[PDB]
Amino acid sequence: MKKLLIIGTGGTIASAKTEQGYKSVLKIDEILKLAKIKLENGYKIDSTNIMNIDSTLIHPEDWEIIAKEVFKALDDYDGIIITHGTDTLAYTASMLSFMIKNPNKPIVLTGSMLPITENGSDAPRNIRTAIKFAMEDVAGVFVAFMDKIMLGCRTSKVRTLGLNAFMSINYPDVAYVKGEKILYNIPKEKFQPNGSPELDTKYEPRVVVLRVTPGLGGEIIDAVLDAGYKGIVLEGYGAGGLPYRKSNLLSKIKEITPKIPVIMTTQALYDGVDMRKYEVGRKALETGIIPAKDMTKEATITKLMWALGHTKDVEKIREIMHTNYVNEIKS
Amino acid sequence: MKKLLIIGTGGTIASAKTEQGYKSVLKIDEILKLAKIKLENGYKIDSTNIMNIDSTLIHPEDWEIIAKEVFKALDDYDGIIITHGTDTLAYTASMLSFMIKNPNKPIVLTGSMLPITENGSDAPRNIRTAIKFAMEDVAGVFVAFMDKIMLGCRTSKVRTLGLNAFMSINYPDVAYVKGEKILYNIPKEKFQPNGSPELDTKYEPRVVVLRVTPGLGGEIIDAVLDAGYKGIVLEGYGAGGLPYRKSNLLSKIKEITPKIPVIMTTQALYDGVDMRKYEVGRKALETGIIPAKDMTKEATITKLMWALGHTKDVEKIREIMHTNYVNEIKS
């Protein structure tokens, strides 16, 4: 009946404790053996390794490699699972959501907070949840973690130790899995194929992400643009503004918004940015700063890199960023 | 019996909806009137305004002004309440925790997610919780929000809309308030005066905070040091490392850690950083990067600014950052 491809990339799920600390050492065949994963029963699992990478530290070039491999596999597989490091899982899931347009199959990313060989490892549970969801007659890019299925472009890693490490940010979970029971939280009907798969791996990697902090000077904006960076993401305040008083930050940004996309997201985790609610937000908007609305940091960053691969025109970037491609952002 | 000082600074709690959006318009007398706050019954509340500031957008100079005003008030008051904007509440609470050593009285910061004049405003509830805790025979810097009392140097704003907007990060709450009932979560005995109050407002404001993202180049480190910044905070990965492969970020940091403190915190909210667990973390540590351990971003940033006001020696900064002054960091 079904054919699944499991793609290994390294990560904690591929790691073992050594004298040098945790080290990515396992190929996908060893992961599946050590996590006691069934390779058959109404399906056949095939496996493969993305060579010379470790998704403990994913590089954007790896996104292009993974996107090309996943896109080729769509022909030959009913479902695709990617095992990946947790720290950038959400970035890969988000970038794949923009690089693979209208996947006609489930692409499910997972990892583990614990190596397989550590006591109470989450790796077997998460691989099994990913396999169960990849066998569903659905399409899109998802993350399987701690029995949840989440839209990939809505996931963030919220903690560094706890097993419930991934959350859907400002968006419902897709589903919850209890064994052979899949409970759809958004209707299965909303994840059906709709148009033909397209591969688009264009991107500009020089996006810099700053936390907005009290006293942060406009000198930092001069510095990153002199370092030749092409987009700026600000982890800003809920009011969505920047100071005019005792500060050149807003005035130095207003000078460069005609030529450089400056995106306002939040340092806070939940509920997004609304630059209209406060006078300070409206002042920021009137400088040509682009609101990230309800997007994750991971979606904002990957989307802008992808957007800048297409155009240097800031109005076109503004339109791309506010286009809802795959439910990464509210309409 | 008791004397309390309520200090107004602006913020959402001082704001009203205008045609220009929310605007900070209310002095503390109007806040207390509009939130129907009792000014007596076993206490007397006096009030005052920090002039020519709006804590919607706090500036570090305002920290020095507030610290000096609060420190003077310790003589004449049993308790001190500061009403403040929510977006930088946690930064002011953390910086006051370093600038006012051994306060011999409760200093309680609060604000509101809603203006007083909006339906279902949290402002009255939060002011009342702050007053109840400021009447306790305790000492320290606390935040009152949504019936919780939290250690100031452990608070972060976690969301932009929800009323339960502040959390104690990697540390228990101090107390929970149900009316005239205060339930201590950490024993009241642990917040007693211990040595004489000292004021220390030295700080260096040029700290820049970067999110670690895939492909972020060492060119950004050259840029911020050429802009004359004196400390770098990295919102890094749970594994606590930075790439050597297809990257000069770690190698460019290793060049400047002898002269510039580079602090590793997390982009994730909960559970802190452990640079020993992974080989990639140990490689980062061996470059002279300073771990923030379990500290909030708000404590890390304010502590480093305060640390850099005292010394330019990176070993002395490393020792200051890992000194547990007021339970901002694990020992």
Numbering used by the authors:
A (entry chain A), B (entry chain A): 1 to 331
Sentences from the paper on this structure:
The subunit of TsAI consists of two α/β domains: an N-terminal large domain (residues 1–184, consisting of twelve mixed β-sheets and four α-helices) and a C-terminal small domain (residues 207–331, consisting of three β-sheets and five α-helices) connected by an interdomain linker (residues 185–206).
The asymmetric unit contained one copy of the protein. Crystal contact analysis showed that TsAI is a dimer in crystal as in solution. In the TsAI structure, T56 forms a water-mediated hydrogen bond with S15. The position of this loop is additionally fixed by the interaction of the side chain S55 with T9 and G85. The network of hydrogen bonds formed between D54 and G11, S55, and T56, along with the interaction of the side chain of S55 with T9 and G85, was shown to restrict loop motion in the wild-type enzyme. Thus, the higher rigidity of the loop M51-L57 is significant for maintaining increased thermostability of the native thermo-ASNase TsAI. Structural superposition of TsAI with TkA, PhA, PfA, EcAI, and EcAII (RMSD between TsAI and these structures are 0.5 Å, 0.6 Å, 0.5 Å, 1.5 Å, and 1.5 Å, respectively) revealed high conservation of the active site architecture and similarity in overall topology of non-catalytic regions, regardless of type, origin (taxonomy), and degree of sequence identity.
